[PDB]
């Protein structure tokens, strides 16, 4: 079954929503920021409400703005893996990851794109100096993962392509 980090988590869920076992985006925020931001080997103020809302959004296929526990376990897992990666690259523990290392970071993450997408991603999620922080690194990975998966989902047979109508599109990109 599940594990010690999870049951401890399941705990917080029960107390918060009994048999509903779902969490709000702001509830999610409080939880994770009691866990990720509190360690001397990772400089971060934690995740922000917008980062959390996007987490709930990409993980919630019922349109209720509530994150389910099974979904949260999946998410946490990814967050722990990407957590390790962020440490491997925040060398001076500066709080961010240099603009030149990021491409290798996303690649250590399994996401193989091209120098242009990162020259789109970096520019889109970094601060003005060109560097990304823990919050944004995670935030960006959640979506890359979300959209990788959606693509697989709408491509049952494995044709390297998907077709979508205006309705499917607005849902796929609005709720994220």
């Amino acid at each position: 079954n599940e594990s010690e980090e999870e049951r401890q988590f399941r705990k917080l869920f029960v107390q918060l929503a009994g048999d509903d076992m779902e969490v709000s985006a702001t509830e999610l925020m409080n939880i994770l920021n009691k866990v990720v931001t509190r360690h001397p080997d990772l400089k971060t103020d934690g995740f922000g409400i917008d980062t959390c809302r996007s987490m709930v959004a990409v993980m919630d296929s019922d349109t209720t703005g509530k994150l389910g526990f099974e979904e949260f376990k999946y998410l946490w897992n990814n967050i722990k893996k990407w957590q390790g990666i962020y440490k491997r690259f925040d060398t001076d523990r500066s709080g961010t990851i240099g603009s030149n290392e990021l491409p290798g970071a996303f690649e250590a993450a399994g996401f193989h794109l091209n120098q242009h997408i990162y020259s789109m991603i970096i520019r889109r999620y970094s601060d003005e100096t060109g560097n990304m922080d823990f919050d944004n690194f995670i935030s960006c990975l959640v979506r890359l993962d979300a959209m990788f998966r959606a693509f697989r989902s709408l491509d049952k047979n494995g044709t390297g392509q998907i077709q979508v109508n205006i309705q499917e599109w607005l849902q796929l990109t609005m709720y994220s």
Binding site: D50, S61, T63, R124, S153, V164, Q167, Y175
Partner: protein, 624 residues
């Protein structure tokens, strides 16, 4: 997870997935595939998803630690009798019965499947047995809130001292009934979940039809006509005396008025005056079959329609006139009755049945529990404004059904919860004498955005202050943008978030630089003025904010009309708890919504409504 899961499911359904002939595979287990594996590996199937342990029994009344589960030994049929049979043909009666554990409403609902072969097959595959390709595995088909779901189970039945503790044949030889009940418990989480059941739900879940029920102490008029017309449609009628034997109505004639009663436990029947029927029994349950259920040449069937929808706190959860402020916000449907019911006695009209069943929710632990108080109103005659023939009937049942005979025309159906602000899903079905037309009544997708034409004009001061702000490149960044607007709006909500500003830039750039020029800053400023107006004119009580429910209004003013689903999406994603949408999110949504349309339009040159993307292009547009 993700709406892409739902979007794939919808697609599958649109092609038959969920129909009786292509039943959804519960927990993805595929009967054959699992069977054949147990054969090759020469073993007897054991269900991973619904193991033979206490958890498959209960959690409270029948939970571990409880002295009711102490002693139970799961055993297969082959070990409880010397040649167990799945089903014995040539039956003229049934001998089903319960064990020490196991509800009685099951006898009733299960016994009713013994009267018609065709109705039993539908829910109990006939090509099964303990002889042929046996491997300790059986499947069954149940109807679930609209679609069919195939379930699998290993034949391990709970026993306590060589005696089934639930549903079993009296002669202890047949086993389909015991298995059908095991399966039904699985798809319900556990045997204990069946404790709070009701024959009407069983009838539905076992056949896929709609069930009218009548307390005989307050019968509707022309009941005898209803019964007679149901029997003609091959409907399943059952009656009883409740406060314990379930009988069925198998005949009704005028020669006086007579209804024939049959005991599924005898092989015999008998007639009685309609008068006695009305006085002896206390409940009549009519299970009205869908038109595909029976194939027996001409048995005369109903015409069926069914739709799906939901209610979501903050956007679509109003319901019940009593709440005029939100009522018009629930989903809305339209029924079109043409040909009337044929002659006989009473006046004219079109007969039809309407049922609204609320789908399963996470916290439902046992059947019949934590059910929402539902109901629906009907009105005689885009998405209808607060400017909106029966209605009423609001109970907390998993389904509310009303029978009607109305003059041919168009009516508007408004399903809803009693109180507003409650999340739940649902399915509506309409059974009718003659062909009727269903149709959703909602806003079609539309975006009509005002295209400002910057051009000359643009002031002297404006231009000057800009230059003294744009730096060497005469352009600013999303970061500089934030700070510039923060100062301005500082003098409602206190500042645009940095994500808001970045998407602004992605929208107005077009110069492909990551920065906004003078003309591009001008347009933004213009659009930023509009938003400020709209937001202001909605906040009629100057509170500095807006409420989730006003969004539909606001979107329309910004040039947008969207379907209920997208409105749910928008409030779920941008409104905070306590359904309030601040100004930053307010414009975030508008900018985002506009950019998403422009992009679709660019990727759809032919203007076809659908775009074809590959993996790499898909990631680029999904997140940039």
């Amino acid at each position: 997870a993700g709406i892409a899961m739902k979007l794939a499911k919808d697609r599958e359904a649109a092609e038959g997935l969920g129909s009786h002939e292509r039943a959804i595979k519960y927990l993805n287990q595929d009967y054959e595939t699992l069977r054949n594996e147990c054969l090759e590996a020469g073993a007897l199937f054991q269900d991973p998803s619904f193991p033979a342990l206490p958890s498959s029994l209960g959690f409270k009344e029948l939970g571990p630690y409880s002295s009711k589960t102490r002693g139970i030994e799961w055993k297969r049929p082959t070990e409880i009798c010397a040649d167990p049979q799945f089903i014995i043909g040539g039956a003229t009666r049934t001998d089903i019965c319960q064990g020490a554990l196991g509800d009685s409403w099951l006898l009733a609902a299960i016994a009713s499947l013994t009267l018609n072969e065709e109705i039993l097959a539908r829910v109990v595959p006939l090509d099964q047995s303990f002889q042929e390709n046996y491997a300790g595995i059986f499947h069954f088909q149940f109807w679930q809130y609209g679609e069919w779901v195939e379930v699998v189970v290993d034949d391990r039945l709970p026993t306590k001292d060589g005696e089934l503790l639930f549903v079993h044949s009296a002669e202890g030889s047949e086993f389909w009934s015991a298995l059908l009940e095991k399966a039904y418990a699985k798809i319900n989480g556990c045997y204990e979940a069946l404790s709070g059941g009701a024959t009407t739900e069983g009838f539905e879940d076992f056949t896929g039809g709609i069930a009218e029920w009548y307390e005989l102490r307050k019968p509707p008029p022309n009941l005898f006509k209803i019964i007679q017309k149901a029997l003609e449609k091959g409907s399943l009628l059952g009656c009883s005396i409740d406060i314990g034997h379930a009988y069925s109505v198998t005949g009704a004639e005028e020669v006086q008025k007579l209804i024939r009663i049959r005991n599924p436990w005898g092989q015999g029947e008998f007639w009685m005056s309609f008068s006695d029927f009305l006085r002896h029994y206390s409940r009549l349950e009519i299970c009205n079959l869908t038109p595909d259920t029976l194939t027996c040449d001409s048995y005369k069937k109903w015409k069926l329609t069914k739709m799906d929808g939901n209610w979501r706190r903050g956007s679509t959860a109003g319901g019940c006139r009593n709440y005029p402020n939100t009522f018009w916000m629930n989903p809305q449907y339209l029924i079109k009755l043409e040909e009337e019911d044929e002659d006989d006695e009473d006046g004219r009209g079109c007969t039809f049945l309407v049922g609204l069943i609320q789908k399963h929710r996470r916290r439902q632990r046992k059947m019949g529990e934590d059910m929402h108080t539902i109901g629906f109103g009907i009105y005689e005659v885009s998405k209808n404004f607060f400017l909106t023939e029966r209605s009423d009937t609001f109970i907390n049942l998993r389904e509310v059904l009303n029978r009607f005979k109305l003059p041919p025309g168009e009516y508007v159906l408004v399903p809803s919860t009693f109180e507003p602000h409650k999340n739940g899903d649902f399915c509506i079905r309409v059974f009718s004498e003659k062909k009727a037309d269903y149709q959703t009544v909602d806003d079609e997708i539309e975006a009509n955005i005002e295209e400002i034409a910057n051009e000359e004009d643009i002031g002297d001061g404006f231009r000057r202050l800009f230059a003294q702000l744009a730096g060497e490149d005469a352009e600013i960044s999303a970061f500089e943008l934030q700070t510039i607007l923060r100062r301005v709006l500082a003098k409602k909500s206190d500042g645009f978030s940095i994500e808001t500003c970045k998407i602004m830039v992605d929208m107005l750039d077009e110069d492909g630089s990551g920065k906004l020029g003078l003309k591009e800053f001008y347009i933004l400023w213009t659009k930023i003025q509009k938003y400020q107006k709209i937001y202001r004119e909605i906040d009629v009580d100057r509170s500095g904010t807006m409420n989730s429910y006003e969004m539909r209004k606001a979107l329309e003013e910004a040039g947008f009309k969207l379907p209920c689903q997208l409105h749910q999406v928008i409030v779920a994603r941008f409104a905070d708890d306590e359904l309030i949408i601040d100004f930053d999110n307010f414009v975030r949504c508008l900018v985002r919504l506009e950019i998403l349309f422009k992009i679709f339009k660019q990727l759809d040159p032919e203007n076809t409504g659908t775009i074809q993307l590959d993996l790499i292009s898909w990631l680029s547009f999904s997140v940039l």
